[PDB]
Each structure stands twice: as structure tokens, then as C-alpha cells.
Design a protein around this ligand. Structure first.
Ligand SMILES: CC(=O)N[C@@H]1[C@@H](O)[C@H](O)[C@@H](CO)O[C@H]1O
Ligand SMILES: [Zn+2]
Ligand SMILES: [Zn+2]
Lengths: 118, 118
């Protein structure tokens, strides 16, 4: 669920408030257009990841509670997870790890989506 | 679906595109915090409407394709829509209708959410 994903982020990127990713580029907040950079593409793969999970009957990625452990840059989705929960958890985790390896460009935060992603 | 909603929006507000609402206030885009104005509210209940519709078995708002019609600024959902389509459709036309009537404040577009949406 959203809350768990927020933790993975604080996990892999402690030097930043999860808000730093609530409105970055064209995808961190989820949308469309040309990803403005590596970090934005991270979010691009994450939205698409959520979209595939939605194809599993009854699966609401945004709300599905899953089992994971986030231990200092280390993220682990637990096996006790079902298809929906397992898929959701791997989306968030991979996105959290992805953020950790992509530079964060202050320019790309809160950009004009109408003009830049359309 | 959202493709149909994007267009519903233009039916009632042809002078604008859905993009003017993609990043407006604290909701038109996602969801969190205190509504900013009437417009930012139209979006709050739209999301709520979707949340109510998700409760409808097998119903996926952003993806369910419904049968609607736009005729000179006025929207109409057709009858042959399944329980899920009909609900989603209505959600969208009420939102579209709510957007046309609310005031659009440039000052509340592209806002720093990390400071106004806690
Ligand atoms: C609270 C939270 O983490 N919300 C995430 C956001 O961080 C992420 O940037 C965006 C795009 O992937 O998807 C949202 O669901
Ligand atoms: Zn452990
Ligand atoms: Zn923004």
C-alpha cells in the first residue's frame, strides 16, 4: 500500500523526504510523456508495474497491503505474499531501489506537466 | 476510462484541456491534504466516487470503457452501460460538470504540494 511504499523510499533514500518524489518529472506522481531523466523513468516503470498488477482480479496496487522488510538500503519482499501482494511489493521495492541509484535533479521537481509532458 | 474522462472534461470546458487539471491544487492529479478551492474539491469527490466504484466487483474506473455522448457542452451516459460502466461514467460527467462551474486559479496550479497538502 501507499504507506509501505513510502517507507521503502525513506529506506533506500534517507537523505530525502518522500515528498521529494510526490511531484518530480513527468512520472513521479504518475502520468505520461518523455521521462525527463533516470529517476523519472524509475517512476515510469513503477506506474506501468502497477498497471499490470491491476490485471489480477481484485488487485488494487495502491491499497494492497503486503509483507516486506526494509533494512538499511536493503529491501526484501516476503514469500508469504500472494500474487497480487507479491507483484505489488516487487513494484515498490524495485522502484525504491531504482530511486536509490538515480541522481535527483532539483530542476526536475514540480515541473509544468501541461507543457512538459504533453 | 480516463481516456474518455479526459475528453469529457473538454466537452464542458473546451477552452481547456484535462492537463490544466492534471496538476492543480492538492488533488487534481492524485490525492492528499486540504482542498484548495472549489475546483480542488471537484477533484476530491471525483476520486471518492472512483473509490466507491472500485467497491463494485471487478470495477476498474481508469480502465472501464463506458458509452457516453457529448452534445454542445452537455454530457450523457448511455443506458447499455454495465453497473460498473454506468457508475464510473456518472463519476466522470459529474466531475466534468463540476470543473466547468468552479473557478480556475492560476495561482493554485503547479503548486509545491510538500508545503500545502500535508
Ligand atoms: C506515497 C507514495 O509513495 N506515492 C507514490 C510516489 O512516491 C511515487 O513517486 C508515484 C509514482 O511512482 O506513485 C505514488 O503512488
Ligand atoms: Zn529482518
Ligand atoms: Zn506539480
Amino acid at each position: 500500500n501507499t504507506y509501505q511504499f513510502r517507507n521503502m523510499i525513506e529506506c533506500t533514500v534517507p537523505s530525502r523526504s518522500w515528498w521529494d518524489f510526490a511531484d518530480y518529472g513527468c512520472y513521479c506522481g504518475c502520468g505520461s510523456g518523455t521521462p525527463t531523466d533516470d529517476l523519472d523513468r524509475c517512476c515510469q516503470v513503477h506506474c506501468n508495474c502497477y498497471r499490470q498488477a491491476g490485471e489480477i482480479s481484485g488487485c488494487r496496487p495502491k491499497f494492497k497491503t503486503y509483507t516486506y522488510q526494509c533494512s538499511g538500503g536493503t529491501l526484501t519482499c516476503k514469500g508469504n505474499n500472494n500474487a497480487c501482494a507479491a507483484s505489488s511489493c516487487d513494484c515498490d521495492r524495485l522502484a525504491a531501489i531504482c530511486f536509490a541509484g538515480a541522481p535527483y535533479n532539483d530542476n526536475n521537481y514540480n515541473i509544468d506537466l501541461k507543457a512538459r509532458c504533453n | 476510462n480516463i481516456k474518455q474522462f479526459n475528453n469529457m472534461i473538454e466537452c464542458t470546458v473546451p477552452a481547456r484541456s484535462w492537463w490544466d487539471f492534471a496538476d492543480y491544487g492538492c488533488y487534481c492529479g492524485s490525492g492528499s491534504g486540504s482542498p484548495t478551492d472549489d475546483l480542488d474539491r471537484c477533484c476530491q469527490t471525483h476520486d471518492n466516487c472512483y473509490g466507491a466504484g472500485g467497491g463494485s466487483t471487478g470495477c476498474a474506473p481508469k480502465s472501464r470503457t463506458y458509452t457516453y455522448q457529448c452534445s454542445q457542452g452537455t454530457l450523457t451516459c448511455s443506458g447499455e452501460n454495465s453497473a460498473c460502466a454506468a457508475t464510473t461514467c456518472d463519476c466522470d460527467r459529474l466531475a466534468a460538470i463540476c470543473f466547468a462551474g468552479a473557478p480556475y486559479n492560476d495561482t493554485n496550479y503547479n503548486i509545491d504540494l510538500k508545503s500545502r497538502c500535508q
